[PDB]
Design a protein around this ligand. Structure first.
Ligand code: LRQ
Ligand code: LRQ
Lengths: 210, 229
């Protein structure tokens, strides 16, 4: 794949924006939405170049490690145009105060809002976003490393076509990748919260093995 | 005289970071945990001295300095550990007199998973032939990045300093003989390892709460004003 073919393949693989159903009410709605987004995520993963070249075991491990980071990056991306709010769905736009209804949720909401504001301030583009989402999938858990190098080349190509100087290109690449450390942190805090009040192997395996 | 962070050339940045480097300390299942806790506490004191010398860090308010150190202290201890453990495959060089293999971690409940992650990180840095000058840049990035979007002109300042550190990393790779494409690929590889260091710190923090607060760090950062030069 050329950088242009990589971009086209990632944009074409994009999952759809889902709608919510119709504290306890909010948690139920958010859980149901996450479960429905997960099914589309498996189908998206299968279309990421290089992902199907991996063994079923490697595919399962990468998705098991990255699913929350991928849900979170998708959330923060569609929430960019809504300062102070999280656009879980077009019919479920929640502010900080609504996160205070559930114990331990306000901290995660605050981190997601801060990430959305950073992407807004950076003017993150759709083509950069799909590259970042693919990196999260391949990195969160030699061929994988060669594919990651190809995504970096693709990110640079996008910035060069956008008219950034050679210096601006490395500075922007670094700024984008550093936010991935923040997304990892949020996923770890989210996973901790899930185990405090407790998406299965069968779900991933049935969809990954036809 | 005093160089402002944004005025530094790549060479001045490297010299400032190398000069700020903390020393390698010596060590003093219950005995093992005590030794590692005591070592971490002693490394923390040197870490405050190091942080104060990281260009741009003293331009921040005392409250912002504490917020950054509170978020980054374990990532900084971990990156230091993985760096000095590079020349020792299968072992973690906590101190020259405390070199531990993964089997030793098995003596403490939940410790093996963290040791395995630290060992994997050390092997990745060895395979990439991480240089001392790149390492100091990475440690500085961890400090300035780990708490920025966890708290306009002051936030922009941190981001401008981070850009200066990236420019420094690129300069080092360019002088090492890497093509422009190879520089971008190496930079990306290194920054992706930072997401793994964040992961390890989160898992490490979780283990601590199962078994350095804002107040403790605030007092240590403030007490630095009283130390002799
Ligand atoms: C997982 C955790 C603790 F970080 C909270 N999450 C973040 C905040 C909103 C609730 C949600 C969440 C979840 F991601 C998963 C579950 C799962 C339950 C079960 O399996 O029983 C329950 C949640 F509340 C969730 N929902 C989403 C939908 C679209 C896009 C993003 C999200 C997120 C991010
Ligand atoms: C924080 C946690 C659970 F991940 C365990 N930690 C990691 C593994 C060894 C014990 C140690 C630790 C600690 F970092 C802090 C305290 C307190 C108690 C510990 F056991 C520690 N000690 C160090 C000394 C030098 C350099 C690195 C380290 C580390 C990393």
């Amino acid at each position: 794949l050329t950088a242009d073919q990589m971009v086209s393949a990632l944009l074409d693989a994009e999952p759809p924006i889902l709608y919510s159903e119709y504290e306890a009410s909010m948690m139920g709605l958010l859980t149901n939405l996450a479960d429905r987004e997960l099914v589309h995520m498996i189908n998206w993963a299968k279309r990421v170049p290089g992902f199907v070249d991996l063994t079923l075991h490697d595919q399962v491990h990468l998705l098991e490690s990255a699913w929350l980071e991928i849900l979170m990056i998708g959330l923060v991306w569609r929430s960019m145009e809504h300062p102070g709010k999280l656009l879980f769905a077009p019919n479920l736009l929640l502010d900080r105060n609504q996160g205070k209804s559930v114990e331990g949720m306000v901290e995660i909401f605050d981190m997601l809002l801060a990430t959305s504001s950073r992407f807004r301030m950076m003017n993150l583009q759709g083509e950069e976003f799909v590259c970042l989402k693919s990196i999260i999938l391949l990195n969160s858990g030699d061929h994988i490393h060669r594919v990651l190098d190809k995504i970096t080349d693709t990110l640079i190509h996008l910035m060069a076509k956008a008219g950034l100087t050679l210096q601006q290109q490395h500075q922007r690449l670094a700024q984008l990748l550093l936010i991935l450390s923040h997304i990892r942190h949020m996923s770890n805090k989210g996973m901790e919260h899930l185990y405090s009040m407790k998406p299965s192997y069968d779900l991933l395996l049935e969809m990954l093995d036809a």
